[PDB]
Short mmCIF file of C-alpha atoms in Angstrom, two decimals:
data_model
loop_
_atom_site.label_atom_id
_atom_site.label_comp_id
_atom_site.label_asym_id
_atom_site.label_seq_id
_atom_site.Cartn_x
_atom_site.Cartn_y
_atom_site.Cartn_z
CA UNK A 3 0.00 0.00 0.00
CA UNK A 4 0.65 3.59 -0.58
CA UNK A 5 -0.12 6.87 1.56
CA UNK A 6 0.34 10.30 1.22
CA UNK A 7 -0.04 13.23 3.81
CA UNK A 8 0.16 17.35 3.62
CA UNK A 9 3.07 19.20 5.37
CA UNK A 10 3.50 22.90 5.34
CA UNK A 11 6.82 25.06 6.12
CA UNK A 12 7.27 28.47 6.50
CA UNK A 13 9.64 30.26 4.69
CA UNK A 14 11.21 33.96 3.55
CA UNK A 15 9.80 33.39 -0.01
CA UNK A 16 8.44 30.10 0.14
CA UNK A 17 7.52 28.08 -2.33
CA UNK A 18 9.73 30.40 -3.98
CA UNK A 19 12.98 30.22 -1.21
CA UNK A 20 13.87 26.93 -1.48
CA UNK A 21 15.15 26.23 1.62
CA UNK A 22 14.95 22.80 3.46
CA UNK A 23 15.68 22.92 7.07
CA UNK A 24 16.26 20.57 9.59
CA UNK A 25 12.65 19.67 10.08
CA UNK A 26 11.84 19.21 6.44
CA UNK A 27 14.77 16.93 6.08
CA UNK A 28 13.74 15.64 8.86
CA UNK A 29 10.52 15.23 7.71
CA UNK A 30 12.15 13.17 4.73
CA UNK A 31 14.35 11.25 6.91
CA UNK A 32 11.57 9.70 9.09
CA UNK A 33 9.19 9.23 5.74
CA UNK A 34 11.56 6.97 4.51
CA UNK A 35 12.37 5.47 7.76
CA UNK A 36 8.56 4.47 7.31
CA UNK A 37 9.31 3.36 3.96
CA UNK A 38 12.44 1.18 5.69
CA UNK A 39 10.21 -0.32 8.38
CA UNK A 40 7.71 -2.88 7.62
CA UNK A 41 6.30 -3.41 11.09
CA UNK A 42 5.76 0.28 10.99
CA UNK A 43 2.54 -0.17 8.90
CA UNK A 44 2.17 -4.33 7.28
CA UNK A 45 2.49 -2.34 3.67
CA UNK A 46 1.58 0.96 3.90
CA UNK A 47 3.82 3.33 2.07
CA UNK A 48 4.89 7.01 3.57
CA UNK A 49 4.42 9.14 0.76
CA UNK A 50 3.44 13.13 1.37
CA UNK A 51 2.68 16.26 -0.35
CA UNK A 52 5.45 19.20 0.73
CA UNK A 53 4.33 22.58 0.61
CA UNK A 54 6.35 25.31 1.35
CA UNK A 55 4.56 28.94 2.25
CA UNK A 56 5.81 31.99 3.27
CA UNK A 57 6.61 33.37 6.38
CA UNK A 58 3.27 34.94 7.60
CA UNK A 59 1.44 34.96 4.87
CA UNK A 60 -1.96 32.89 4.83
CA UNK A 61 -2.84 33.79 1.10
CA UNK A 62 -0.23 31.54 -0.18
CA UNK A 63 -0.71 29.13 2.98
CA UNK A 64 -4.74 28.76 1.33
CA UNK A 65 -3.24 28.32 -2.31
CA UNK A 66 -1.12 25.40 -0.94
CA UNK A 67 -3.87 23.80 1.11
CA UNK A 68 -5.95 23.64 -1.63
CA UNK A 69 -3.61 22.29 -3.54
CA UNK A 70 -3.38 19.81 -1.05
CA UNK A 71 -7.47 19.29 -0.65
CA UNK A 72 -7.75 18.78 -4.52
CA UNK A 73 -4.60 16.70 -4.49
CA UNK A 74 -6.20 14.86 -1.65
CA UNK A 75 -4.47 14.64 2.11
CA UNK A 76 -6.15 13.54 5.36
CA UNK A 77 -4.59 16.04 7.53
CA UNK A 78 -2.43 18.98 7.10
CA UNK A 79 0.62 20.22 9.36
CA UNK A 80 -0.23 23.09 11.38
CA UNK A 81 2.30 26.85 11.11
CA UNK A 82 3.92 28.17 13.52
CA UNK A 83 1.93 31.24 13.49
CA UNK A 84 -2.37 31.55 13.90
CA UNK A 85 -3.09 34.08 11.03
CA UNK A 86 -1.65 30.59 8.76
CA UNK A 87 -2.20 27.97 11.52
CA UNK A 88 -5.92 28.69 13.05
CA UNK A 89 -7.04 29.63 9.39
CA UNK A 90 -5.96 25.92 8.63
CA UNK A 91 -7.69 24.76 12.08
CA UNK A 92 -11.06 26.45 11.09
CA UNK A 93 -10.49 24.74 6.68
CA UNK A 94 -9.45 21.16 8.89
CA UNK A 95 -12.79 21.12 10.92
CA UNK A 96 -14.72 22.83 8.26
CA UNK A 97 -13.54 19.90 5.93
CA UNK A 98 -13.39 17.22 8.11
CA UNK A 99 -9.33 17.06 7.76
CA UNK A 100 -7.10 16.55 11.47
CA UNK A 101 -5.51 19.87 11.83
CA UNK A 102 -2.19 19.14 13.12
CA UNK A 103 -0.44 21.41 15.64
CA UNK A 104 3.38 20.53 15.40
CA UNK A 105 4.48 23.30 18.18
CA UNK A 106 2.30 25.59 20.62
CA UNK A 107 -0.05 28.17 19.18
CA UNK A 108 -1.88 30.23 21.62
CA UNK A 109 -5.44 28.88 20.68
CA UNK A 110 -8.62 29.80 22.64
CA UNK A 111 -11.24 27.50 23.65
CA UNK A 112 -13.50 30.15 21.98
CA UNK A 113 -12.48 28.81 18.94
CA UNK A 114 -14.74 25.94 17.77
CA UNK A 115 -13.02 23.61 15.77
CA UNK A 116 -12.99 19.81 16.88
CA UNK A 117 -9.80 19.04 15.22
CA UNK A 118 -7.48 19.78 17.17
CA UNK A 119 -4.19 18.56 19.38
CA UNK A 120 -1.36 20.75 21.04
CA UNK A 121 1.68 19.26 21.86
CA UNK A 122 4.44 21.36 24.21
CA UNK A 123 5.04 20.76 27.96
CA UNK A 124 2.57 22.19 30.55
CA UNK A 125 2.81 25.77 31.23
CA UNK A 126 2.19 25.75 34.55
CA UNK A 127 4.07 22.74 35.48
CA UNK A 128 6.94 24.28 33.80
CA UNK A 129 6.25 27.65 36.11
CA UNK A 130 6.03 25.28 39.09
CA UNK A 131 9.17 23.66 37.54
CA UNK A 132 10.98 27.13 38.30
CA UNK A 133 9.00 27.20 41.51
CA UNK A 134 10.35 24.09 42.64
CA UNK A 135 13.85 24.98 41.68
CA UNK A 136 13.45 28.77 42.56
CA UNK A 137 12.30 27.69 45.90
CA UNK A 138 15.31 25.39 46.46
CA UNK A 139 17.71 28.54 45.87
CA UNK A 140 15.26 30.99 48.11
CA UNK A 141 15.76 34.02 46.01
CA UNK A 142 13.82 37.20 45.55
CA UNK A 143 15.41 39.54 42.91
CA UNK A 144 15.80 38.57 39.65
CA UNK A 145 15.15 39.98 36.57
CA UNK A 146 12.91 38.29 33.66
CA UNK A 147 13.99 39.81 30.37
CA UNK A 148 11.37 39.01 27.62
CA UNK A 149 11.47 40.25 23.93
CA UNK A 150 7.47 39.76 23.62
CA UNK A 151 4.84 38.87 26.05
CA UNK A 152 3.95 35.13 25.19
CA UNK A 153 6.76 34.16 27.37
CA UNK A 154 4.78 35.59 30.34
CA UNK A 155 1.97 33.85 28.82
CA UNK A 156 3.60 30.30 28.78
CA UNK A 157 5.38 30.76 32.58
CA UNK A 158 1.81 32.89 34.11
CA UNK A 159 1.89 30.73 37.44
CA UNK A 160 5.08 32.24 37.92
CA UNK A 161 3.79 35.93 37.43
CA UNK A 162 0.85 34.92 39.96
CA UNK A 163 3.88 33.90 42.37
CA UNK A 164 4.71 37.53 43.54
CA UNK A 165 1.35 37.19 44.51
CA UNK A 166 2.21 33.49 46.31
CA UNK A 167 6.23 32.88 46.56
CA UNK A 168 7.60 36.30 48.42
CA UNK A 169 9.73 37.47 44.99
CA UNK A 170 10.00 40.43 42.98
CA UNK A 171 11.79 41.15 39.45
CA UNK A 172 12.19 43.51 36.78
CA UNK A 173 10.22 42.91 34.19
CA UNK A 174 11.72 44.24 31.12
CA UNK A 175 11.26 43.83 27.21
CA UNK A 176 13.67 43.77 24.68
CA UNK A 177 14.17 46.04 21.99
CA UNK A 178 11.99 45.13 19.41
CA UNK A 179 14.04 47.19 16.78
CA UNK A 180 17.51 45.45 17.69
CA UNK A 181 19.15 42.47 18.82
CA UNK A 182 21.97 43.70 20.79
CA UNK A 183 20.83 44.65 23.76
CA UNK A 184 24.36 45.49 25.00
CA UNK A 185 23.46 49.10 25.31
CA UNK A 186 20.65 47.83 27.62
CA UNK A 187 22.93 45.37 29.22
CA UNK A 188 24.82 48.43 30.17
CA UNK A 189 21.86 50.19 30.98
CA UNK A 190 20.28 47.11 33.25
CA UNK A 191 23.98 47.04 34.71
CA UNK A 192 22.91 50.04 36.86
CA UNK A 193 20.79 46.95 38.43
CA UNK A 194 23.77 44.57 38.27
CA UNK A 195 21.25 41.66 38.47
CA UNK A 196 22.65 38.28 38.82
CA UNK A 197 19.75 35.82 38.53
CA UNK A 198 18.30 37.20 34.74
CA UNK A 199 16.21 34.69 33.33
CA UNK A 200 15.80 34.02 29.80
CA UNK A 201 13.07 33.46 27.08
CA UNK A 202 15.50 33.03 24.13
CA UNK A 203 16.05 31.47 20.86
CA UNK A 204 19.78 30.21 19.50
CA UNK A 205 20.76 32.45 17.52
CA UNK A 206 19.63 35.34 19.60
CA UNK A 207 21.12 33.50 22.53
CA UNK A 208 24.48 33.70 20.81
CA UNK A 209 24.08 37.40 19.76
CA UNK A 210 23.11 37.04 23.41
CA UNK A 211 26.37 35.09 24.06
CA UNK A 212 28.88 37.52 22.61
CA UNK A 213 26.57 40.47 24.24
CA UNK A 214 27.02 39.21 28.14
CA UNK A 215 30.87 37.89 27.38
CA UNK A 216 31.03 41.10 25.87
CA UNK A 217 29.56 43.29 28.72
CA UNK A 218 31.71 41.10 31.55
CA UNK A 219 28.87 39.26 32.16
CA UNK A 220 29.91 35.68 31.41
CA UNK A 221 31.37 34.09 35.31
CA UNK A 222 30.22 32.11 37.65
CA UNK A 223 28.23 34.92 39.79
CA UNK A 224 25.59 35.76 37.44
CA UNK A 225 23.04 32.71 38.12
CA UNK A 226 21.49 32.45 35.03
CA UNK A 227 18.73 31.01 33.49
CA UNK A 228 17.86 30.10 29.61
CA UNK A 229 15.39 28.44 27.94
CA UNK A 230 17.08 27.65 24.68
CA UNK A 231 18.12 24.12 23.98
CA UNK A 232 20.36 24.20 20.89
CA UNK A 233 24.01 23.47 22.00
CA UNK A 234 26.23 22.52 19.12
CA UNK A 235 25.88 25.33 16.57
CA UNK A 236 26.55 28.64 18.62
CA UNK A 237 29.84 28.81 21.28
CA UNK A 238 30.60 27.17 24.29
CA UNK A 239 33.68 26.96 25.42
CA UNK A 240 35.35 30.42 26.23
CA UNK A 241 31.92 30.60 28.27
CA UNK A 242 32.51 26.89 29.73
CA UNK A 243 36.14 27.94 30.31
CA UNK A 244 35.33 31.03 32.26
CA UNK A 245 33.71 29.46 35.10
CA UNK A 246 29.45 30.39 34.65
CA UNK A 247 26.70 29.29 36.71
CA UNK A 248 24.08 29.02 34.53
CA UNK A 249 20.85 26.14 33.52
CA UNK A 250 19.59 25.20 30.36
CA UNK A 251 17.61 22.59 28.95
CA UNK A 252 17.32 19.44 27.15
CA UNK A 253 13.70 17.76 26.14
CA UNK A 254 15.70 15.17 24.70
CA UNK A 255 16.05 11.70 25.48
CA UNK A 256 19.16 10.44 23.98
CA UNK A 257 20.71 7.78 26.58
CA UNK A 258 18.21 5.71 24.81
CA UNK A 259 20.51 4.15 22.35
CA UNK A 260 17.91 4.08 20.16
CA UNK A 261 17.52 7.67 20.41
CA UNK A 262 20.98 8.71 20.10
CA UNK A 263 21.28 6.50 16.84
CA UNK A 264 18.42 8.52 15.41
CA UNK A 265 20.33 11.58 16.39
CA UNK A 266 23.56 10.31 15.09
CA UNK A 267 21.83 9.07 12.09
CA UNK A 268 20.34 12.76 11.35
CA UNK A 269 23.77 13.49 11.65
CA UNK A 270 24.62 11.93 9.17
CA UNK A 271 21.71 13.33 7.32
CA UNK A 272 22.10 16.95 7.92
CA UNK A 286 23.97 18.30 12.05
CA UNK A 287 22.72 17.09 15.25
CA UNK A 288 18.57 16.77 15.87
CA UNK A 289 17.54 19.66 17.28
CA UNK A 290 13.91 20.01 19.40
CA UNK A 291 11.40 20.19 16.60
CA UNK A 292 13.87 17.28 14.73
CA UNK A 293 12.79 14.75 17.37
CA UNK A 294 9.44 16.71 17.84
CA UNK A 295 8.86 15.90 13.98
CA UNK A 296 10.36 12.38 14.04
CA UNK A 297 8.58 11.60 16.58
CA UNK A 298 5.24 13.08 15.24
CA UNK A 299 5.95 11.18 12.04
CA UNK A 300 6.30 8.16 14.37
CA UNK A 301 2.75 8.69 16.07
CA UNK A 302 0.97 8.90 12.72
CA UNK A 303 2.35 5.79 11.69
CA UNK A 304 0.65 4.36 15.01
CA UNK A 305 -2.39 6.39 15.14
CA UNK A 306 -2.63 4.93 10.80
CA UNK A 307 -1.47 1.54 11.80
CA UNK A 308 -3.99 1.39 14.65
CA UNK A 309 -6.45 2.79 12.21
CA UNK A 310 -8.42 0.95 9.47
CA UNK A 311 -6.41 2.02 5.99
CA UNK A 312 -8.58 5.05 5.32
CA UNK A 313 -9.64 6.48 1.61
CA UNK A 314 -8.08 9.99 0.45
CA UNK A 315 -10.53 12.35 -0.51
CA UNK A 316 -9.92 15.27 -3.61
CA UNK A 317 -11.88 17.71 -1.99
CA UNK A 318 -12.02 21.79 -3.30
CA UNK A 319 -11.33 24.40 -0.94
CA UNK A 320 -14.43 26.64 -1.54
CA UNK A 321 -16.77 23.49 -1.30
CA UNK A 322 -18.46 22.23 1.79
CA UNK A 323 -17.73 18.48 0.80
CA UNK A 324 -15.52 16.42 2.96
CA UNK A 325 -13.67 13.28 4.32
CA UNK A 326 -15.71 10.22 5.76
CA UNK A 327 -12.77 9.66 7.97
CA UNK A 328 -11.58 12.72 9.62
CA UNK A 329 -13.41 12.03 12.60
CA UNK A 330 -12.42 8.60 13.39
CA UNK A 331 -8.62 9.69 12.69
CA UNK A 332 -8.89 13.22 14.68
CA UNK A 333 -10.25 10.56 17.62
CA UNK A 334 -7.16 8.15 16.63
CA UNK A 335 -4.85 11.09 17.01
CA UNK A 336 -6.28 12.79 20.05
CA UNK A 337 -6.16 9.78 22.20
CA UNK A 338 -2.50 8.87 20.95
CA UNK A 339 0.09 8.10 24.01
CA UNK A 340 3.69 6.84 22.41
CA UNK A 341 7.19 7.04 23.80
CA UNK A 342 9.35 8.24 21.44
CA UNK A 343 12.92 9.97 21.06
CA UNK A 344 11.73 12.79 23.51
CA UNK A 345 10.89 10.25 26.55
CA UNK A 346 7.00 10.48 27.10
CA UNK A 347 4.74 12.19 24.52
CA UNK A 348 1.07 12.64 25.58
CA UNK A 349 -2.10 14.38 24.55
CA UNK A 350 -4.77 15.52 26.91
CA UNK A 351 -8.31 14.61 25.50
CA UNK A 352 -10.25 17.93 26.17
CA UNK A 353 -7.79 20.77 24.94
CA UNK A 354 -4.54 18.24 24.09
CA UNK A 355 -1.27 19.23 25.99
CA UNK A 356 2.28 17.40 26.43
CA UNK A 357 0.98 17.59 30.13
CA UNK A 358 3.38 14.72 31.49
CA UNK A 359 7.36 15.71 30.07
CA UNK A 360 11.01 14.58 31.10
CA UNK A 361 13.31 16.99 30.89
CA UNK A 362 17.75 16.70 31.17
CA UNK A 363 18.51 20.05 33.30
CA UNK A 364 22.03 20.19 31.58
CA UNK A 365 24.15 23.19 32.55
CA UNK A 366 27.76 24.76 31.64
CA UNK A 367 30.24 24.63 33.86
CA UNK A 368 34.05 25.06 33.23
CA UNK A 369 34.72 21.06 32.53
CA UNK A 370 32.40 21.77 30.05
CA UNK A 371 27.76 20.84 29.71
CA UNK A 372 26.58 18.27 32.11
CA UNK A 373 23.14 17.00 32.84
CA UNK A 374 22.73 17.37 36.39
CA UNK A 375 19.14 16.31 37.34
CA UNK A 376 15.56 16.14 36.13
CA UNK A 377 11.95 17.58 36.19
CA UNK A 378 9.06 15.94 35.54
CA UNK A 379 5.71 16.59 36.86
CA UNK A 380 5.91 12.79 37.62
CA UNK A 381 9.24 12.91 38.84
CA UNK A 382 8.85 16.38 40.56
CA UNK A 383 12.36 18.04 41.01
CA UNK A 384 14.60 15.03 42.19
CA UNK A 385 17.67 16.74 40.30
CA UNK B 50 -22.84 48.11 0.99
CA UNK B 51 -22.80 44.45 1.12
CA UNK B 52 -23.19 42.87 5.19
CA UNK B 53 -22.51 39.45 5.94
CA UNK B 54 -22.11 37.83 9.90
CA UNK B 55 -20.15 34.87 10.23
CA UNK B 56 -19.62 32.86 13.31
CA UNK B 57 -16.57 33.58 15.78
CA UNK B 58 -13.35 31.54 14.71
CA UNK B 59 -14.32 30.06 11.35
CA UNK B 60 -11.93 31.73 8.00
CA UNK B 61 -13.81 28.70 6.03
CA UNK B 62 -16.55 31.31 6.51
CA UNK B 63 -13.87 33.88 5.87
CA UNK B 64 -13.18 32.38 2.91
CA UNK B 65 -17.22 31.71 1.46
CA UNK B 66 -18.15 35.49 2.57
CA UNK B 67 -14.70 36.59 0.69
CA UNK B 68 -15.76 35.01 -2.41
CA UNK B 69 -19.29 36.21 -2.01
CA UNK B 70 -17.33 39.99 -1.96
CA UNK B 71 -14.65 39.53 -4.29
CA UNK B 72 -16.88 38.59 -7.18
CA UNK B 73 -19.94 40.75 -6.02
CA UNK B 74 -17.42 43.37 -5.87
CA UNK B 75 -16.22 45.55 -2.77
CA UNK B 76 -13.44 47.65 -1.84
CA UNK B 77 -13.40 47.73 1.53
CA UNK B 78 -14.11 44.99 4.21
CA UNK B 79 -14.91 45.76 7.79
CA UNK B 80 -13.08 43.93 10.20
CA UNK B 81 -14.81 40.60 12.34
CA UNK B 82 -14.04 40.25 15.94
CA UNK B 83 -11.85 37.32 16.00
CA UNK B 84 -8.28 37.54 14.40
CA UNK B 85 -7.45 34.38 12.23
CA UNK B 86 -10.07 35.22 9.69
CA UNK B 87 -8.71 39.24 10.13
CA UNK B 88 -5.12 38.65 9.60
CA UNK B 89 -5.76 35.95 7.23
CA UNK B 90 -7.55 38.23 4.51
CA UNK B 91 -5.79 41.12 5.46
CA UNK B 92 -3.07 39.05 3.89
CA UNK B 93 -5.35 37.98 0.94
CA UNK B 94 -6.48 42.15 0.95
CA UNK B 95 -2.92 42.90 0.94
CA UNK B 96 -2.10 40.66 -2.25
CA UNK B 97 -4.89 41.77 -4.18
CA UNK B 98 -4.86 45.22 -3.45
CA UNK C 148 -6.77 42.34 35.04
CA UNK C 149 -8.56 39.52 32.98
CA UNK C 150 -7.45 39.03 29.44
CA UNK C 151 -4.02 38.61 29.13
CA UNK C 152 -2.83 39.70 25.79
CA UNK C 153 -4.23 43.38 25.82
CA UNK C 154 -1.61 44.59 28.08
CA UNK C 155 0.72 43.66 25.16
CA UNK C 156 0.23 47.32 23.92
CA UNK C 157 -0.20 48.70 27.11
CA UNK C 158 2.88 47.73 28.10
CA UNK C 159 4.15 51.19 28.88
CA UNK C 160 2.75 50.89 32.21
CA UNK C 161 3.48 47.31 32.51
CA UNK C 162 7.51 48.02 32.43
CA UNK C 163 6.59 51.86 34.35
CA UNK C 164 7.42 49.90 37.93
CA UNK C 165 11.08 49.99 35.88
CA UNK C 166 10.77 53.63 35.74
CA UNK C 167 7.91 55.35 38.50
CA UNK C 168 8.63 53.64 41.74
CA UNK C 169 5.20 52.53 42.44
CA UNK C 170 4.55 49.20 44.30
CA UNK C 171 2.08 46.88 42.76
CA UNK C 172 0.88 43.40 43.03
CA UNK C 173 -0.91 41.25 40.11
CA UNK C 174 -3.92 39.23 39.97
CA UNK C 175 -5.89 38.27 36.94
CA UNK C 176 -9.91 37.53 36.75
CA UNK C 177 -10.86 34.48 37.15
CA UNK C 178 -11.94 33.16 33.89
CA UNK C 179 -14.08 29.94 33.86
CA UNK C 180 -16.52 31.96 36.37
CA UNK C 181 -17.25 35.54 36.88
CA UNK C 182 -17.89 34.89 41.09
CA UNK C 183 -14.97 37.52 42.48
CA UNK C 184 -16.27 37.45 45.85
CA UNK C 185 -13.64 35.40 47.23
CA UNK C 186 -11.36 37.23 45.40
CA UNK C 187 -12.58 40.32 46.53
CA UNK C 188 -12.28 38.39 50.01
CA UNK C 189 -8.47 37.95 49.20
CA UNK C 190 -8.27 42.02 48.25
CA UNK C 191 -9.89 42.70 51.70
CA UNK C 192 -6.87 41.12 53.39
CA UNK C 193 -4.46 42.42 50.54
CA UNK C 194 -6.46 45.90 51.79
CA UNK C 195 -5.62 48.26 49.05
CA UNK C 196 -7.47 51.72 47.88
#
């Protein structure tokens, strides 16, 4: 047998940049892994229908869906952004398709699609993560510096804890015009703060990086705190061999050997996996469950501007929302209301001057054993 | 002027009512209450002009 | 306050305790019910004007 499924990625011209990242590779990679593995689905074939859109820019993003539709798919991967994403949501319940949801979007239960699962780490586990390891260092100042608001939005147990926990910070955006804050390093240096904690992403953490090494910034009395896991393509070691007390994060699970030959194996595909590598593997994975656990269901040419539809997208947006499967990241879970990664394992790795070590764990199962 | 309602978080509806406009004809749209259906033709408004 | 993304724009006053040394504490609404009592309950001990 043969199947075929709808992707979408998001790039700076899109169709039309012709970029393939380590997702889309990745998407390839596990595919044909599918295609490799016979006891992942008797006969069933992983074919799939790429379509790259823009970066924010749903006009293009409804072009390539119903491209998709009158190709036929049975569910389409959800952007990273809702003016693309929640359009798609609205097309995969008004259709009858499973919307996927690869990352976090901030949806509302307002919203009134069916088809529907999230898939990130609880929010307010993670915020009574900090709590639990906050609480276990007994401070009070800090600073939490934030270049948007969602990253309050995603830790807002911890902004009710002023209200619980006895702590205060300074809440500060970044520039929104400029990446190097180093002007406001020097300017937030009239606060000297040495617990700053940090909503970040790579390559802003190494602009980041080069900003705190290069404001004296970078030892072993500034207790930091960062978010980003992506250790292999930005700099380490004159940061390691200054001396730094600092945490940072790994979702992955890759003393699995299992796990760390996929990783290897991407490397020798791309480059190490990063999160949304073993996020997508893994996601590739679950279909291949959630399709292998399902009857082999028909593929449906459907127009975009019609009101016609799949016989099958509720049975499969059931097959999907109750999907449980450990994977590359340790557990992967749905809730069955509003779907959530509720249950997560985490590797608290952190830089020290003999160089990244993974010093202890948090789960909402395992609490903060470290 | 041309009205239409259409339920909160649906661009399916978005996308029906846009048609309905586009080939009746409009050149202006006044903005729903939800945002994926806003942002979504304001994108479409944007590349059509 | 009670929605939490309209204070994105207003965030003037949200980073103002950076600048104007006023002391503040947060709470949101409660959003599944629209019963502040005990709330208001809570803001009779936290007994502010």
């Amino acid at each position: 047998h043969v199947i075929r499924i709808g992707g979408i990625f998001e790039y700076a011209d899109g169709p039309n940049a012709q970029v393939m990242n380590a997702e889309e590779h990745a998407f390839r990679f596990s595919a044909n892994i599918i295609n490799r593995n016979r006891t992942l689905l008797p006969n069933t074939t992983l074919t799939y229908d790429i379509q790259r859109i823009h970066f924010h820019d749903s006009f293009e993003a409804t072009k390539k869906a119903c491209d998709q539709l009158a190709l036929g798919v049975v569910a389409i991967f959800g952007p990273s952004q809702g003016s693309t994403t929640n359009a798609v949501q609205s097309i995969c319940n008004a259709l009858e398709v499973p919307h996927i949801q690869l990352r976090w979007k901030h949806h509302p239960l307002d919203n009134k699609d069916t088809f529907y699962v999230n898939l990130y780490p609880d929010y307010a586990s993670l915020s009574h993560a900090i709590l639990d390891l906050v609480q276990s260092l007994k401070w009070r100042s800090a600073t939490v510096v934030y270049d948007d608001s969602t990253g309050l939005i995603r830790l807002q147990e911890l902004i009710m804890a002023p209200s619980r926990y006895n702590i205060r910070l300074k809440i500060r955006q970044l520039p929104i015009d400029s990446d190097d804050s180093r002007p406001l390093l020097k300017e937030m240096k009239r606060g000297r703060e040495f617990r700053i904690i940090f909503d970040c992403s790579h390559t802003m953490a190494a602009q980041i990086l080069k900003q705190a090494m290069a404001m004296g910034m970078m030892t072993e009395y500034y207790h930091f705190i960062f978010t980003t896991l992506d250790l292999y393509a930005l700099d380490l070691e004159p940061y390691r061999y200054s001396g730094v007390n600092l945490t940072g994060f790994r979702i992955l699970n890759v003393d699995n050997p299992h796990v760390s030959a996929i990783v290897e194996k991407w490397s020798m595909e791309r480059g190490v996996m990063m999160t949304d590598a073993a996020l997508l593997y893994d996601a590739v994975h679950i279909v291949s469950v959630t399709y292998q656990r399902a009857p082999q269901m028909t593929v449906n040419s459907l127009q975009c501007h019609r009101h016609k539809a799949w016989r099958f997208g509720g049975r499969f947006m059931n097959f999907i929302k109750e999907a449980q499967w450990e994977g590359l990241t340790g557990r992967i879970v749905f809730n069955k209301t509003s779907g959530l990664r509720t249950d997560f394992d985490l590797d608290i790795i952190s830089l020290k001057e003999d160089g990244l070590e993974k010093v202890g764990v948090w789960s909402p199962a395992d609490g903060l054993n470290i």
